[PDB]
Structure 1
Amino acid sequence: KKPITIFGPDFPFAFDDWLEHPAGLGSIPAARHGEEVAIVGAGIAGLVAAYELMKLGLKPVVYEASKMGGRLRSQAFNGTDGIIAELGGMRFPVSSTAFYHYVDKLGLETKPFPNPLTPASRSTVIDLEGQTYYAEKAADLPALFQEVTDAWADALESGARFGDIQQAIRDRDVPRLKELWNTLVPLWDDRTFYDFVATSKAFAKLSFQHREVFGQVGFGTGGWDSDFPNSMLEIFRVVMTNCDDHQHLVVGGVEQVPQGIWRHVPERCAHWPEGTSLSSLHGGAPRTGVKRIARASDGRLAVTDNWGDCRHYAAVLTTCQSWLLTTQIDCEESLFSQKMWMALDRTRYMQSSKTFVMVDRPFWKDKDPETGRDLMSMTLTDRLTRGTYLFDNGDDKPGVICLSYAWMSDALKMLPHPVEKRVQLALDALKKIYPKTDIAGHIIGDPITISWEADPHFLGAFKGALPGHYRYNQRMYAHFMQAQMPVEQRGIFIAGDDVSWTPAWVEGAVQTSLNAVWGIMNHFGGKTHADNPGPGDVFDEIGQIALAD
């Protein structure tokens, strides 16, 4: 059967094909080769855009105020080799084909993420209202869980034509996908996931306890209460495109993706010599942080860095989170329309906390001889840890445990504590669920924790779309199409997690980056190959619908 991929629904453009096509992403007039283009941010969107723009014969100049890779971050444990903790993105649905084009281009290895109730996870434990349920396969779980999923499946079918939409994504039936999706947009934009569940027949006839459980752990593979405040359109996008299943981690860390792009020598270059990489073009590193972006008197854009070095560019791509433009960067008002500023100012963020420890061996695989249970499991609970993940690197090698993976309030509970106290609170809660298991006695190396908002170069882990925010996301997603814009707003671009329709998923950032690649190519008078048309070529036809005032 034809695979689900992140194919629209909003802009069902075949990004994978475009990348894969042997003609390449187009060209720029030789008169403009070597000319510079500024990119704010060295995250995935920034680097992808830079790598392809280098390939088209430009010299991208990448600015990074903090850490390379952005929210793709793999930190090594003390004293080990290649045993990492994933601090940002960690599980990558195979439906993320544009993302995976670069994984494979770098020849990196992946393996299935140990999600609850998947072949990759041996067992799962669900812990609710002080009671514990053990499961080696879904069916082992009590009846209430199956009832929960049936209502979910039923609510999606009733309320979204889920099956029709999934089929249209599989066959890449564009007119059909847009027909289905377009009738949904004005009906769910301004309603939350909460309202979805509240007004669905299936959930209504179930108990309050059923709903409660659905929020905490879903039907036993992960909960939904962090997402409840979101526009129901966001949630649809996630489940429709199977973002939530068949996921992989990158072996040795997904940070290798942005680090590898940086150092990768493409087989073919416009203008540039053999062996040119983003790294060689920069002398090894991106520029420091951007502090100011202004319209210069000669028409160009002035980018001043933290150290006062001011440079002039025909174009600038920003990928830093939207609120930074309006607070931390001095970004001149004339550079965006009044309605673009309002879209950027209304982006909201979800909070995330994760805490990791390394262990001497995957002791959790050991069986308790009394009960036949694994000593520990992929753990879902209403206690403060929420989610606990188990990473086996072999019996031969040390294991990693993500003790706690929380969002929103639960992440806010962890925010003010030092690492030590987070690890201790987690271990306490895990003692309650597994009173006989001695996790602490297997722990080696240093603990590793992360709170994203706590970083000054981030506002949260990723955006979450509020109800009614379709129009703001729509203006942002279309910002790379500049034919109709006043001159004073052109030549600046945006891309990234904020611009994407599926914010907590790395593919949306890659996709938005590629749209920007086209917007920038176009801005330098370039165009796509006739047999490999690009985002801007088809966007007025199949692009995200616009809503009437």
Structure 2
Amino acid sequence: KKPITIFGPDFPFAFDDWLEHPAGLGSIPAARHGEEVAIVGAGIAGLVAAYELMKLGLKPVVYEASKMGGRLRSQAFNGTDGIIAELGGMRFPVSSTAFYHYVDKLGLETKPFPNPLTPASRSTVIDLEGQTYYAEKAADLPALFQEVTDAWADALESGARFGDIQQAIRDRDVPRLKELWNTLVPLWDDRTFYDFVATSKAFAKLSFQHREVFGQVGFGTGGWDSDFPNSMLEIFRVVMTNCDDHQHLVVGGVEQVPQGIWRHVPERCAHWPEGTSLSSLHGGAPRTGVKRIARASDGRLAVTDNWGDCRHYAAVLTTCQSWLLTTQIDCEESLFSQKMWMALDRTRYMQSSKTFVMVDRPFWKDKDPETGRDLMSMTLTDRLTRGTYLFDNGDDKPGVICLSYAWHPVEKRVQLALDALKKIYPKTDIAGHIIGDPITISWEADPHFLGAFKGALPGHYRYNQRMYAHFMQAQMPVEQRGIFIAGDDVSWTPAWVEGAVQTSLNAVWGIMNHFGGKTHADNPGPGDVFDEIGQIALAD
């Protein structure tokens, strides 16, 4: 079978084909080469856009208020050479084909993520209501977990035509894909993942306890409870495009992606001398934080940094979490329509915490001979810690444990997790193996950021659709043209890096178009097919 990819459903454009075609993304009239475009944010969406716009012969000017890379952030443990904790995104589904274009272009290595019940994990432990279940494969788990898995598979088949949608994604059958998906949009926009579960016949036939299990740990590979309040459409998108499985980690830390894009010399650029990179063009560093964006009296856009320095541009792309545009960035009211402002004000963000320790070796691989069990496993629980992941860097290098994912000082956070993990594994001495420093993150603190990523709110498809289409500007008044937005808040998969890359590439098409440029006839880009296969607009 042809692979599942993040191909629609909302906009089934082949971003991958577009990036891979030998013709390139398009061209800008040479009279405009060298002109500047401001890009606010040096996370993956800002840098992908800057890189491709550099290749088209413009001079991107990246601004960054905090650290290069944004929410792709990898921290080395003290003393070590490349043993990292992932502070932002860490598990990248292979269906993320536009993201992996850049990973592959940089020649970075990836490996399978140690998810429960996969080849990359030896064993799993589920701890619920004080009972522990050990499993080396899914069939080791008690029947109740398979019942949960069947009820979920049946709910998605009955409720959303999961099988048909996946096949149309595999085949890239756009007409069929849009027919299946567009039926679901007005049905499920207004309804939570809570409501999908509670009105599905398959979950209704199971005991309450089964629905609880499903929220805490799913069928044994990860719970759903943090997603229950969100729009069911968001959950459909996730599961239909395999975001939630077949995931890889980037060896040496995914921060190498935006750091490598910064430094990478394209083989072929319009206008620039051979050897040019984003880094070259900038004299080595992005500009500082943006505090104001305004329309200048010459009709160009005015961008003022934190220190009062104000520079003019024909186009500005903002990739900070989009709610900062309403408060933090003083962005001139005439720059967005009233309805765009309303969509921008309404975004809400989910919060997350992860704490990592380093260990001297992957001791979890040892066997307890009184039981046959690994000393420790990928752990899913209803307790504090929720999920614990084990990273085997090889038998004779340090391991890393993500002691706690979930949705006090570092020292207290780690002690609380080790106490909970002692309840679950009363015979294993985890503490004894820990070395170096603990690394903790909460995205909340710092800001600059509002949360790990947005939670798609029921009833907000209309706002999402207006923001997603913002790059299509032929019909907008001249006072609203020339500013562009991208990043994972803009995208249909807000928790997943491929959303940030796809919306970024839509913005690249938009900006190219803005400068009088166009795609090559044999390699059309997002704005060439958007009106025909773009996301449906709902009435009112």
TM-score, normalising length: structure 1: 0.98
Q: Which residue of 1 aligns with 2:186?
A: 186
Counterparts of 2:273 and 2:488, CA distance in 1: 33
Q: CA separation in 2, counterparts of 1:455 and 1:196?
A: 35
- Alpha-carbon displacement from aligned partner over 1:229-254 (angstroms, at most 9, x marks no partner): 00000000000000111110000000
Q: 1:499-549 CA distances to partner (integer Å, 9 max, x unpaired)?
A: 000011100110000000000000000000010000000000000000011
Selected match of 1:527 from 493, 518, 525: 518
Q: Deviation at 1:79?
A: 0.3
Residue by residue, what CA displacement relative to the aligned partner does 1:474-516 show, whole Å, maximum 9, x if unpaired?
Answer: 0000000001111111100000010000011100110000000
Once residues 335 and 135 of structure 2 are traced to their aligned partners in structure 1, the CA distance between those partners, rounded to angstroms, is: 55
Q: CA RMSD in A?
A: 0.5
CA distance in structure 2 between the partners assigned to 1:301 and 1:453 by the alignment: 31
User: C-alpha displacement at 1:467, in angstroms?
Assistant: 0.4
- Quote the offset at 1:464 in angstroms: 1.1
Relative to the length of structure 2, the TM-score reads 1.00
SS at structure 1 position matched to 2:413: helix
- Post-superposition Cα deviations, 1:271-323, rounded to whole Å, max 9, x if no partner, equal 00010000000010100100110110110111000111100000000000122
1:458: which partner in 2? 449
Query: In structure 2, how many angstroms separate the alpha carbons of the residues matched to 1:223 and 1:324?
Result: 31
Q: Deviations over 1:167-226 (max 9, x none)?
A: 000000000000000000000000000000000001011111100000000000000000
Partner Cα distance (2:321, 2:341) in 1: 13
- Match of 1:226, SS? helix
Give the CA deviation at 1:30. 0.4
Q: For residues 408-441 of structure 1, give each alpha carbon's deviation from its aligned partner in whole angstroms, at most 9, with x where no partner exists.
A: xxxxxxxxx1111100111110010001111110
SS in 2 for 1:67: coil
Residues 338-395 of structure 1: per-residue CA shift (max 9 Å, x gap)? 1101111111111110000000000000001100100001000000100000000000
Supply the distance in 1 between the matched residues of 2:223 and 2:54 (Cα, whole angstroms). 42
Structure 1 position 89, deviation (Å): 0.5
CA separation in 1, counterparts of 2:49 and 2:266?
14
Runs of 4+ that moved beyond 4 A: none
Give the distance between the partners of 1:147 and 1:283, measured in 2 at CA.
Answer: 59
Partner SS for 2:293 = strand
2:436 and 2:138 mapped to 1: Cα distance? 34
Aligned residue in 2 for 1:112: 112
SS at match of 2:227: coil
Paired residue secondary structure (1:355): strand
SS of equivalent residue, structure 2 residue 230: coil
Q: CA deviation at 1:98?
A: 0.2
- Which residue, out of 406, 416, 427, partners 2:418? 427
> Which stretches in structure 2 are left out of the alignment for 5+ residues?
none
Cα distance in 2 for residues equivalent to 1:404 and 1:520: 41
Alpha-carbon distance between aligned partners in 2 of 1:459 and 1:160, rounded to the nearest angstrom: 32
Matches within 5 A, 1:326-475: 326-407=326-407, 417-475=408-466
3-state secondary structure, aligned to 2:488: coil
Secondary structure (helix, strand or coil) at the match of 1:388 reads strand
> For 1:349 and 1:374, how far apart are their aligned partners in 2?
38
Q: Which residue in 1 is equivalent to 2:90? A: 90
Distance in 1 between residues matched to 2:409 and 2:144, nearest whole Å: 38
Q: Equivalent residue of 1:51, what SS?
A: helix
Match of 1:410 in 2: none
State the 1:456 CA deviation.
1.3
Counting matched residue pairs gives: 540
The alpha carbon displacement at 1:99 in A equals 0.3
User: Who is 1:156 aligned against?
Assistant: 156
